[PDB]
């Protein structure tokens, strides 16, 4: 059944709750972003109101074929009324179109649901600065102190320098980047840019990217693989077998592959710096795992919560085991005592 942490008290609202059939008493279904564990269950047959960002609305229409009359996009950073309740959508710093949702309850309670987010100090100067938030439904993906990672900026610098050096040394090298969802577009766009190439991809992926309102996108991507030296492939194919196979397909236009796998966290983060990363190599193929995250580090999450000073925290990630629940609740109390709220 629909879990309590997907329900907004005092409303008929649910968040990211599309796989339970009809939720008894739900008058509006919000969708934070277009990732499959969140939209799971939506289709052309859905006949309730869906509230979301413009970009998420483009993806629902074009990729899932949800009918237009049930899609209600809202602009960001704007006070809106939905079934008699004031809401605001804020940028979540996750994937394109991803939002956090502020609900202003008739009784005076204010609730923030983060969806999936990467906490940033820039959020401290949004509409969140303007009033008190009583309850926080929090993206706790990496809520443990072992989870450190570099800035997105540091990671992109590393990838750009690496790719540029490789291709300038060998003009017959191919660069490949893995993907399995929206998000992390900076990785492959920044590399294609330093190399003066467009990124080549399947028709399905090109369609997905054309929904995202990225400026000048027609200048940066293409379905013509042969004219491109940065290819995108399914993440599943980013391994030595899948890459040798792929290399055959290019007809001796290339003799070397340099491939990037943008992972979340991986335990080499507890030892190694970004400057010190190395690839796995077999033959003329090298694969780099780069820790490009679109979720908060432990320290980023801690800072955001200690700034906001909520009265109650409701985790939305890692809630399935008692040991994870109990560990998270321990960090929350530490944070509150350290900061004095």
Which among 151, 153, 186, 185 has a CA at the least distance from the CA of 300? Answer: 151
Beta carbons of 197 and 163 less than 8 angstroms apart? no
CB of 217 to Ni ion, least distance (A): 21
Query: How many Cα atoms are found within 13 Å in the side-chain-facing hemisphere of 288?
Result: 24
Footprint of Ni ion (CB under 5 A): 35, 116
CB of 316 to Ni ion, least distance (A): 11
Which CB sits closer to Ni ion, 48 or 180?
180
CB of 28 to Ni ion, least distance (A): 21
- CA distance to 23, 71, 82, per residue, from 28 (Å): 10, 11, 8
Residue 199 neighbours by CB under 8 Å, 6+ apart:
177, 188, 189, 192, 220, 221, 222, 228, 230, 231, 232
Which among 236, 191, 237, 201 has a CA at the least distance from the CA of 222? Answer: 201
CB of 208 to Ni ion, least distance (A): 15
CB of 36 to Ni ion, least distance (A): 9
Beta carbons of 101 and 88 less than 8 angstroms apart? yes
Beta carbons of 257 and 243 less than 8 angstroms apart? yes
Which CB sits closer to Ni ion, 116 or 185?
116
Which CB sits closer to Ni ion, 116 or 300?
116
């Amino acid at each position: 059944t629909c879990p309590f942490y997907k329900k907004i008290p005092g409303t008929g609202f649910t968040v990211d709750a599309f796989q339970y059939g009809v939720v008894e008493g739900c008058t509006a279904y919000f969708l934070t972003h277009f990732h499959s564990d969140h939209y799971a269950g939506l289709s052309k047959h859905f006949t309730f109101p869906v509230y979301c960002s413009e970009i998420t609305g483009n993806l629902l229409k074009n990729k899932l074929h949800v009918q237009e009359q049930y899609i209600h996009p809202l602009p960001l950073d704007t006070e809106c009324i939905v079934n008699g309740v004031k809401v605001v959508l804020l940028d979540a710093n996750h994937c394109p179109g991803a939002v956090m949702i502020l609900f202003y309850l008739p009784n005076g309670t204010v609730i923030l649901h983060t969806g999936d987010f990467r906490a940033d100090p820039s959020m401290e100067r949004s509409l969140l600065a303007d009033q008190k938030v009583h309850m926080l439904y929090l993206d706790t993906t990496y809520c443990s102190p072992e989870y450190t990672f570099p800035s997105q900026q540091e990671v992109i610098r590393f990838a750009i320098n690496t790719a540029f050096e490789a291709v300038t040394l060998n003009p017959h090298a191919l660069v490949v980047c893995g993907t399995y969802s929206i998000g992390k577009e900076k990785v492959f766009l920044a590399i294609a840019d330093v190399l003066g190439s467009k990124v080549g991809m399947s028709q399905e992926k090109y369609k997905t990217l054309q929904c995202l309102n990225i400026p000048e996108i027609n200048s940066l991507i293409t379905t013509d693989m042969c004219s491109s030296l940065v290819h995108l492939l399914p993440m599943m194919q980013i391994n030595f077998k899948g890459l040798q196979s792929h290399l055959k397909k290019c007809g001796g236009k290339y003799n070397q592959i340099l491939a990037f796998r943008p992972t979340g966290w991986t335990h080499s983060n507890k030892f190694t710096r970004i400057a010190d990363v190395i690839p796995q190599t077999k033959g003329n193929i090298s694969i780099y795992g780069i820790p490009y995250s679109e979720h908060s580090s432990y320290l980023e999450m801690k800072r955001f919560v200690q700034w906001l000073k909520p009265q109650k925290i409701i985790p939305t990630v890692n809630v399935g085991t008692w040991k994870s629940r109990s560990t998270m609740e321990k960090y929350f109390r530490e944070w509150k005592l350290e900061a004095g709220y």
